[PDB]
Structures are given as structure tokens and as C-alpha cells.
Amino acid sequence: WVTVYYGVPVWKDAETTLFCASDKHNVWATHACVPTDPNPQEIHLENVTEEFNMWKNNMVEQMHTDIISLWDQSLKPCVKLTPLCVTLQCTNVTNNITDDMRGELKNCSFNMTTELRDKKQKVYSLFYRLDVVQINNKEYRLINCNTSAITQACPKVSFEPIPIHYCAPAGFAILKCKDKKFNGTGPCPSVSTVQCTHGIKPVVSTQLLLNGSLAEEEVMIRSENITNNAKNILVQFNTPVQINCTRPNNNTRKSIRIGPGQAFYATGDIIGDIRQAHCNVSKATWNETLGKVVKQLRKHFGNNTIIRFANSSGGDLEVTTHSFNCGGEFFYCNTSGLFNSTWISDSITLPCRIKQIINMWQRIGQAMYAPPIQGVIRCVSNITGLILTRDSTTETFRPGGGDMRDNWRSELYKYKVVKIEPLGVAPTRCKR
């Protein structure tokens, strides 16, 4: 009566280790990743359903620890700048500036070690205001002198995002859901199977989500709990909004030897006038896109609810501004110029600041020093979504953001990992 079958098409939810596939020694060691399967076959599954939960998806946790581990490994074999944490003697940069840049740059002189242990040299460099702390012309310290070590990033290792594909080991499969009305949880009927996902760009940002995937059928609004004001709301656009960012100053760079075999890259002088860094967003596009978000957002509050976007909530720059990583520079842009409307029933210019000393993972640990880059940086990118948080007829939303194990969460919401279980039994009418 008992017949044993092998190769039965069933599975259980499971957690396993995923490995990557992809495609000059960049920050994510993509040359160490296996080659992709070109033209992989996607297999649609007819007459199946499955349940998903993007807020409990362990693929997010692996992407989180993979990116952090890679960041730290890549910065490990790089020159330390410990000898640079000295008393600095600084004055203001005033010779060729606009008023908006007055006080933004400082000219600092200091006594630094030469390759010979017994000799010192007088050198100077420029620093941005945000990296320099006054002690009492005036004496200064770098911002991390009493908190952590500063390591200079290696100049040969780039940071631009490179798509990384996550692949399951044999015996496991990835279920991708196509239901275009899926809100992040529960039954999601249009399921297909892939062995390895498409590439995801490991972009790190706050408030605005850049260079991600787009929605199609509608703007999607997803949250763990809509009525819980302690949770974030992820909004995915079905159209991109284009932005253009610039340095715009023409920078120079010089090397200082600080010991045998090691050098520090100092910001040199500036060619031409000094102007403030900034980002432009097309105004009409932003105006229309925001209206689409509101129409859809109202479905969870009522047709008589007024939606206001107020302003940024306040706090440290890392959580109040738009953290933008581009061209090898770290930008902190003022988004109050975007989120300024109330909804009832040209270009926008966002002034932006630059920092060289970066605490990338919002932790106390080794800080990275971004070496200066010569020439002029020009960045073009797509806003694919945004993060909102919510504070009796008017609801208030704010950019919020700042959370890690987010952003990537908007790319991995479509996937679940399952374990294949080939054996099973059933009754029939045979005997040996």
C-alpha cells in the first residue's frame, strides 16, 4: 500500500546562507563574486499561493552584514592617519569666496612627522568646517580625536554601486512574487521561481532612495503597521525623479609623506571661485510625483484627510539631511526645499554641505577619511522612492529616515527563500 516518491515538488520555509554572483578592486570585492548565469530561466508556477513578510525577511539581515563586513575589510590595508591628530593652527579662507561659503573652509597649519623619525615638517591643508572642532589665530582638533581612529580610504578603491545578485545553493530556491498590488505581507499569488535574483545596487542613503527599482501599477506604500507612528513608511515611485548634484569647485590635491611608505592626501588650494555645493531636482516632476503619493496615501486615512509634509524633524546631520554618497564625496543636503506642501481635497535648488570624516555605519568604531578628489564632480541620479514617518483632520509626514536595514528592504521585499524536500509518501494499490 505505501509508495515512496522521490523528486516531489514541495517545500518549507527556511533560512540558509546565500552567496553572490556578478557580471578593478572596488570596495565590495566584486571580483571575488562568482560569474552570473546569463539569461537565467524564470519559471512561473501555476495554481500556487504563498505568504510573504518583508518585515521578517532574513535576506535583509544577510545583505546588512555582508555590506558592513566588506566595507571594513576593504579599508583595512590602508594608511592610518593617527599622526595627524595634532593641535592645528587655523584661519578662515576668504580670498575668493561667495558669502554662502564664508566660514565654511578653514586653512590649517600643523607640525607633522617626515619619513625620518627625527625630523618634522610644517605643512598646511584645507578642511571643511564640519570636520574641525575648536579647542579654546585659534587652535583646533579633528572631530574624531577624542573618539576614534581615523583611517584614510585607499585612493584606488572606488565606491560607486555595482549590482550584486543573491543566489541560493542547490537544494534551495528563491520564490519571487509578481503581485503588483502586494503591500509587503500576506498571500501573494503570482509566484515564480528563480535560482538567483536580479542585481541590487548597494546604495547607502537617507530620506531619498536613489537608483532602486520602480513600481508599476501604482505608487506603492508599505509599512509594518500603518497606524503605528513608531514605524517607517516606504514609498515606491512608479516613475523616476531626476536630480543633478555638483561640487562645483575645481579642487587640487597634494601628497604628504607621514612615515616610510605612507602618505596623506591633503586638500590643496582651489582654482577659481569658491561656491556652495548643491543639488537640483526638476520642479514640475517633483510637484506631480508628490501629488501621486498623496492620492494613494489617503486611501489609508480617508478622503477627507489633509496631508502635510511639514519639514525634517531635527537632530544630527546624518538623520536630518539627505545623506548622499557620489563621486567619492559625502554630501549632506537640505531637503526642506522639497517637503514643503499641504494637500487639501523651473528647478528646486537644495543647498548642500560636504564632510570628509565619515562614520559610515552610525556606530562608534573606526572612522573613514575621504581623500580629496581633483577637478569637479558632477552626479546624475534617479529618486525611486522615499522614506516618510508620521507624527485631527490633518496628518503630518516628515522625511525621517536614517535607519539601516532599510533601503535594501525595498529591493528584497519580493523574495523568499525556501527549502526543497524531495521525499514523501502516499497510499496506492501496488505491492512487491
Partner: protein, 109 residues
Amino acid sequence: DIVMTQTPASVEAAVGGTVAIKCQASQSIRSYLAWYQQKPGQPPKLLIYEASKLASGVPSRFSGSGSGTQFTLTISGVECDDAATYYCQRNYDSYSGAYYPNGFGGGTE
């Protein structure tokens, strides 16, 4: 891919009596069935969407319900303005994941 059959063909009733029209499918289309009314010479008017919701401009005599693969359109009483055929439209594509108005079954008065 898409199977839609309207079965109570050629049903009519005197004013004051009632009628019902029903459709079946080989695939579930839960809560994604739309009903239309087509009077001669006119484009179809949307009556009911998402199985049970009435469209704006639709008289209270129209109603209906269903789920899965079994759905019905009902008329609470004939008012002599029912001289139309009715159609079943599927608003869900099981292969693409999209929810757009692809595929009809129908033709019953």
C-alpha cells in the same frame, strides 16, 4: 490561460419580476470581476466592480456577489430599462501579476 463562461443564456422577465446572470471560471479571480451593461448602439456601461461594488451612476436595483471561480449579477426587479446584454470582465492576470481589464465572457440579456 483565461476561461470565462456566462451560462444562463437568453433570460428575460416581465416588469416587476427579477433576473440573475452568472459566470464561471477555471481560474480564481477572487474579487476581480467586473460587470457591464450594453444597450444597443452604446459602449458598455460599468455596473459592478470588484464583484460587489457599484460604480457611480448605477441604480440601486443592481447588485451581485461572488468569489473564487463562481460569480452572480442580480437585478432586484425589472424596470424596463434592462434592454441590454451583460458582460463579465476579468481584472486580474495570473501570469503577469497586473490587474488590468483583460478578457470577457458574456452576451446574456
